[PDB]
Design a protein around this ligand. Structure first.
Ligand SMILES: [Mg+2]
Ligand SMILES: [Mg+2]
Ligand SMILES: [Mg+2]
Ligand SMILES: [Mg+2]
Ligand SMILES: [Mg+2]
Ligand SMILES: [Mg+2]
Ligand SMILES: [Mg+2]
Ligand SMILES: [Mg+2]
Ligand SMILES: [Mg+2]
Ligand SMILES: [Mg+2]
Ligand SMILES: [Mg+2]
Ligand SMILES: [Mg+2]
Ligand SMILES: [Mg+2]
Ligand SMILES: [Mg+2]
Ligand SMILES: [Mg+2]
Ligand SMILES: [Mg+2]
Ligand SMILES: [Mg+2]
Ligand SMILES: [Mg+2]
Ligand SMILES: [Mg+2]
Ligand SMILES: [Mg+2]
Ligand SMILES: [Mg+2]
Ligand SMILES: [Mg+2]
Ligand SMILES: [Mg+2]
Ligand SMILES: [Mg+2]
Ligand SMILES: [Mg+2]
Ligand SMILES: [Mg+2]
Ligand SMILES: [Mg+2]
Ligand SMILES: [Mg+2]
Ligand SMILES: [Mg+2]
Ligand SMILES: [Mg+2]
Ligand SMILES: [Mg+2]
Ligand SMILES: [Mg+2]
Ligand SMILES: [Mg+2]
Ligand SMILES: [Mg+2]
Ligand SMILES: [Mg+2]
Ligand SMILES: [Mg+2]
Ligand SMILES: [Mg+2]
Ligand SMILES: [Mg+2]
Ligand SMILES: [Mg+2]
Ligand SMILES: [Mg+2]
Ligand SMILES: [Mg+2]
Ligand SMILES: [Mg+2]
Ligand SMILES: [Mg+2]
Ligand SMILES: [Mg+2]
Ligand SMILES: [Mg+2]
Ligand SMILES: [Mg+2]
Ligand SMILES: [Mg+2]
Ligand SMILES: [Mg+2]
Ligand SMILES: [Mg+2]
Ligand SMILES: [Mg+2]
Ligand SMILES: [Mg+2]
Ligand SMILES: [Mg+2]
Ligand SMILES: [Mg+2]
Ligand SMILES: [Mg+2]
Ligand SMILES: [Mg+2]
Ligand SMILES: [Mg+2]
Ligand SMILES: [Mg+2]
Lengths: 99, 25, 142, 108, 129, 58
RNA sequence: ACACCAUGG
RNA sequence: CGGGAAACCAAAGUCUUUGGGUUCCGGGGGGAGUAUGGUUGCAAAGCUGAAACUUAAAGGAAUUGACGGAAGGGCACCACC
RNA sequence: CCUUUAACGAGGAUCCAUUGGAGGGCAAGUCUGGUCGCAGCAGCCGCGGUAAUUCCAGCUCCAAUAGCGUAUAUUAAAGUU
RNA sequence: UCAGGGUUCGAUUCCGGAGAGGGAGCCUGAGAAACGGCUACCACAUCCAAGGAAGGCAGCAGGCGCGCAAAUUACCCACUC
């Protein structure tokens, strides 16, 4: 029987949306049905930041961030534990998880 | 698939038979 | 979700019903005629035939037996049909190459019970009943 | 063999297996080749083929594997068909061949 | 596109009595609807009602009591012949002790218990019970 | 097992024969109905709630 | 941050 | 609100208290979108479309188990280190 | 022929009621003997593999009754046209 | 057969039509394209002295054939006409 009110997809009032390739599977999924993730992380790791901030040539240097936007097929997003299957009525929560 | 391939097999047999019939006459 | 309701639509209603009757199996075979043309009887209740030979057919699982049938060729058509013999030990009354009167089985076209593809049953062997040949009320004319 | 199925009553065949000879309308045969649907070809010890059928009492119980001695019942009115009544151990098969029961025609 | 104006009026009154309202607005209106509501009022199934002029088809406000149970329209105005009237009031009505078939006749818009009295049939409009 | 397994009429032949034992001419017609009414309605000697059938044996 | 895992009186 | 076999639907509601208007189309499961005739197409194919025969079920929503080379907690030297 | 009438004409062992059933649908036996997935029954679900309420028979019981069973066409059941 | 609506049947004693093996042509008569009338072809079939002649039960009985499927080669104008 039907499992989602929105068919597991965002499209309403539209015929087609251009696809997009997964980032590990290289599959080919609609841009509104893919699973997105913005990632902002330091170019250094948190273990290293006290060593690199110690041998700068300059006195004040705030290291750069790495901005990346990722898209996942559903099979690969479930295999990499990005999302998990949820209870039947607990499936209708749209708020993102608490930080 | 099994509906897809059933359809495909029937199509290829139909082609072979039509060819045989219309080449006989 | 829509059926014309207006006051002069009778032609549409009648011509549409007359069409949709043809999807009802039980009506279709009464009126195409291809059933009556294909019927191994003549469209009658009974038919005479001559016993070609005696066979046994293994019943359809789970239950198991060998079901003791004649194979007959009918007089009027000349076409060949298999028929059941209806009681314990009757297959000894049926000599070979005598006549018989076969009848229907009971579901109007279809094999009854566990027997695979037998649709008729015997009533008379040689102008004497099976029910009398078997209950003792009569004996074979020879 | 070897399954979960200890559910059916155990073999207990160790008790007193006799010997069994022909009758009217019974005869020994050998298995030529097996066919689907359960029924199998046969070859009796006089020449008829009698495309033979496994009786309901033997269904998935005694395995009539290829090329062994069998006992079949004939039909009173049909000859090209028969039904397996019994399978012999190689012990009974030699016992019958020596006893002067089955012909010195076919091998085991 | 609004082929039948009496059908809307009776469906509108009916969708609101079930809800429990006390007044309903009907729009458009006609001589036919006004005659029908009069038959429904002489018998006590609705209260008095008020017609609004607006220089077009007007609107009606009707005061409902709870006594009404159903009213409806028979969509093709079939003919009825006073010998086929029983076969109608036995299919449409819930019991022979109440309820009315409303039909239009040469002597006006009336209810079958009066058409029998004046010996005339005509065209069926609806029913209320 | 012996003979043809397919031997026709096996059980009807090997069943041992027994004659009809009776003499008593049964009743017929109205007089039979007169019987069934009396036995089913006139005297029904009272019993526990676990009621019994007219041919009971067990 | 994925070698291979078929079958059942 | 009400409806439904229920999942569910502000329409899939206003339906045994059954009739606003009109178009297409279904009639147990298979044989089968097959055979054949017509037609369109360079071709691949599309449109229209049977019967013989065979069968007591095939199916839909939901419930409790059992299983998973599915996920989250937890446990045992008849499990491991 | 029927009707009207003399003379013969009833003790029940005949001046003899049959046809189909007895697991369910569906009124009536968890009797006794026989057969052993055989012979068979069964419109449908299903009975029979050595302890058969369903097969073959005795006994008893059920339904209609001077009638009852079977095959077939058709109508209601079918709001399954 | 049927609540209401309907479905199926109507060779069959009353009324109308059509036909006497198949097709065709005509005489006589108020009335016939008549077959218990005639002529010819087609298909059947009978008698013969081998020259010739003769025929029409889908009237009543009866017989063969066909098939699952249908009564006696009886009596009489007394009744209706
Ligand atoms: Mg699913
Ligand atoms: Mg838009
Ligand atoms: Mg849209
Ligand atoms: Mg699309
Ligand atoms: Mg169709
Ligand atoms: Mg069918
Ligand atoms: Mg494994
Ligand atoms: Mg294998
Ligand atoms: Mg395999
Ligand atoms: Mg809303
Ligand atoms: Mg809304
Ligand atoms: Mg909304
Ligand atoms: Mg709607
Ligand atoms: Mg509605
Ligand atoms: Mg409406
Ligand atoms: Mg179908
Ligand atoms: Mg199949
Ligand atoms: Mg199909
Ligand atoms: Mg189609
Ligand atoms: Mg074609
Ligand atoms: Mg065309
Ligand atoms: Mg073409
Ligand atoms: Mg179609
Ligand atoms: Mg079955
Ligand atoms: Mg399901
Ligand atoms: Mg886990
Ligand atoms: Mg421990
Ligand atoms: Mg261990
Ligand atoms: Mg260790
Ligand atoms: Mg009896
Ligand atoms: Mg019986
Ligand atoms: Mg009995
Ligand atoms: Mg019963
Ligand atoms: Mg009962
Ligand atoms: Mg015993
Ligand atoms: Mg016993
Ligand atoms: Mg017993
Ligand atoms: Mg009907
Ligand atoms: Mg039907
Ligand atoms: Mg009627
Ligand atoms: Mg007539
Ligand atoms: Mg006729
Ligand atoms: Mg007649
Ligand atoms: Mg006439
Ligand atoms: Mg006239
Ligand atoms: Mg004739
Ligand atoms: Mg004259
Ligand atoms: Mg003439
Ligand atoms: Mg005449
Ligand atoms: Mg003449
Ligand atoms: Mg002549
Ligand atoms: Mg004549
Ligand atoms: Mg005659
Ligand atoms: Mg005859
Ligand atoms: Mg008759
Ligand atoms: Mg006859
Ligand atoms: Mg006279």
């Amino acid at each position: 029987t039907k499992k989602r009110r929105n068919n597991g997809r965002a499209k309403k009032g539209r015929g087609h949306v251009q696809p997009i390739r997964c980032t590990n599977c290289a599959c080919c999924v609609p841009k509104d049905k893919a699973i997105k993730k913005f990632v902002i992380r330091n170019i250094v790791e948190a273990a290293a930041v006290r060593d690199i901030s110690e041998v700068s040539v300059f006195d004040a240097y705030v290291l750069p961030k790495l901005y990346v936007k990722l898209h996942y097929c559903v099979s690969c997003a479930i295999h990499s534990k990005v999302v998990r299957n949820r209870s039947r009525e607990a499936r209708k929560d749209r708020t993102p998880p608490p930080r | 698939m099994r509906a897809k391939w059933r359809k495909k097999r029937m199509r290829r047999l139909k082609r072979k038979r039509r060819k045989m019939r219309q080449r006989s006459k | 979700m829509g059926k014309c309701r207006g006051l002069r639509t009778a032609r549409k209603l009648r011509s549409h019903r007359r069409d949709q009757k043809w999807h009802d199996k039980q009506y279709k075979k009464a009126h195409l005629g291809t059933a009556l043309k294909a019927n191994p009887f003549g469209g009658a209740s009974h038919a005479k035939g001559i016993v070609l030979e005696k066979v046994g057919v293994e019943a359809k699982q789970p239950n198991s037996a060998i079901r003791k049938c004649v194979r007959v060729q009918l007089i009027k058509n000349g076409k060949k049909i298999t028929a059941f013999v209806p009681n314990d030990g009757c297959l000894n009354f049926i000599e070979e190459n005598d006549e018989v009167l076969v009848a229907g089985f009971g579901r109007k076209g279809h094999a009854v019970g566990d027997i695979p593809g037998v649709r008729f049953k015997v009533v008379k062997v040689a102008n004497v009943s099976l029910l009398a040949l078997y209950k003792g009320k009569k004996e074979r004319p020879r | 063999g070897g399954k979960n199925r200890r559910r059916g009553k155990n073999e207990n065949e160790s008790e007193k297996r006799e010997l069994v000879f022909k009758e009217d309308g019974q005869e020994y045969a050998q298995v030529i080749k097996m066919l689907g649907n359960g029924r199998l070809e046969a070859m009796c010890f006089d020449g008829v083929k009698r495309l033979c059928h496994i009786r309901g009492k033997l269904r998935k119980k005694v395995w009539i594997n290829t090329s062994d001695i069998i006992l079949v019942g004939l039909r009173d009115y049909q000859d090209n068909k028969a039904d397996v009544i019994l399978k012999y151990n190689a012990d009974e098969a030699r016992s019958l061949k020596a006893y002067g029961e089955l012909p010195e025609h076919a091998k085991i | 596109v609004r082929m039948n104006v009496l059908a809307d009026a009776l469906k509108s009154i009916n969708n609101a009595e079930k809800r429990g309202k006390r007044q309903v607005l009907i729009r458009p209106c006609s001589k036919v609807i006004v005659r029908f509501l009069t038959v429904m009022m002489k018998h006590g199934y609705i209260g008095e009602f008020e017609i609004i002029d607006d220089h077009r088809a007007g609107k009606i406000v009707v005061n409902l009591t709870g006594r009404l149970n159903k009213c409806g329209v028979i969509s093709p105005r079939f003919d009825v012949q006073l010998k086929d009237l029983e076969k109608w009031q036995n299919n449409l009505l819930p019991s022979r002790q109440f309820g009315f078939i409303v039909l239009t006749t040469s002597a006006g818009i009336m209810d079958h218990e009066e058409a029998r009295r004046k010996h005339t049939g005509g065209k069926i409009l609806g029913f209320f019970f | 097992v012996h003979g043809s397994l397919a031997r026709v009429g096996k059980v009807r032949g090997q069943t041992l024969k027994v004659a009809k034992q009776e003499k008593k001419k049964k009743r017929t017609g109205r007089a039979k109905r007169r019987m069934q009414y009396n036995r089913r309605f006139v005297n029904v000697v009272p019993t526990f709630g676990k009621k019994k059938g007219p041919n009971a044996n067990s």
